[PDB]
Ligand binder design. Sequence first.
Ligand SMILES: [Cl-]
Ligand SMILES: [Cl-]
Ligand SMILES: [Fe+3]
Ligand SMILES: [Fe+3]
Lengths: 141, 141
Amino acid sequence: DLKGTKTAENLKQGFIGESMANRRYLYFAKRADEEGYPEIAGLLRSIAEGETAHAFGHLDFIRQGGLTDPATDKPIGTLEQMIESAIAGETYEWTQMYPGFAKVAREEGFPEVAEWFETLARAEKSHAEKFQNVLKQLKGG
Amino acid sequence: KDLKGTKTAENLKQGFIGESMANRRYLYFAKRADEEGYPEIAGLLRSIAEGETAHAFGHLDFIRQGGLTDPATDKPIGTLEQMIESAIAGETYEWTQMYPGFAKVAREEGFPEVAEWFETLARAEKSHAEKFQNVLKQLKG
Ligand SMILES: [Cl-]
Ligand SMILES: [Cl-]
Ligand SMILES: [Fe+3]
Ligand SMILES: [Fe+3]
């Protein structure tokens, strides 16, 4: 059983890093796009597909091992559990995380960052509601 | 406009990590919905995932504009050259240290299948690092 092992923690950290790598490389590719480096941009995009495969493989072992979602500590074995994990994370983000980030940005004197965090709190609330509707569809049959 | 040293800087970093994971998670969940025959759910997951891309990229915008470093590597990512240098730094850590160590631990804990996966990833990240090193030569030439 993977539960409680260092390998379980390493799969989680692997997933975090691969997730960031895909985002980072696609963001970098947009800079190459604008500056006129299509071969560099294309390489960044192709490497990013590698990082997708790596992240998804980590999630495969996590799920096969009975481990929980790195982002929420909720099970992700079935589709319903996956949607329940999405709801749990989104609910935390709109009710707690992004409002708290916005308050801190305001208190530190960064009103534009605070406004961004408030936009994201509203967006994650919308995401949460959409996922809640998906769960009603699945559990209702 | 200088965010260095603030709680808001750390919150942007943690926001980037979570949004990066959210996009990966939702696309992985969408593949399950695909297999089971829920195309409307899968398409919603994919569209919400695009939202999480926008959120992650916006966090990176504020990180770069605020004088902060890449969440994954603690290296500056202002210019395209710096972005590639950040990719190289992260990949180098992953192939020289991170994934080989994960593989050693997995074999020690009795997970040879997981260890083989980590060894495949160590080799893959070494290839990625070498491709990025070739790109940097092009940009700096
Ligand atoms: Cl090019
Ligand atoms: Cl459907
Ligand atoms: Fe969301
Ligand atoms: Fe890589």
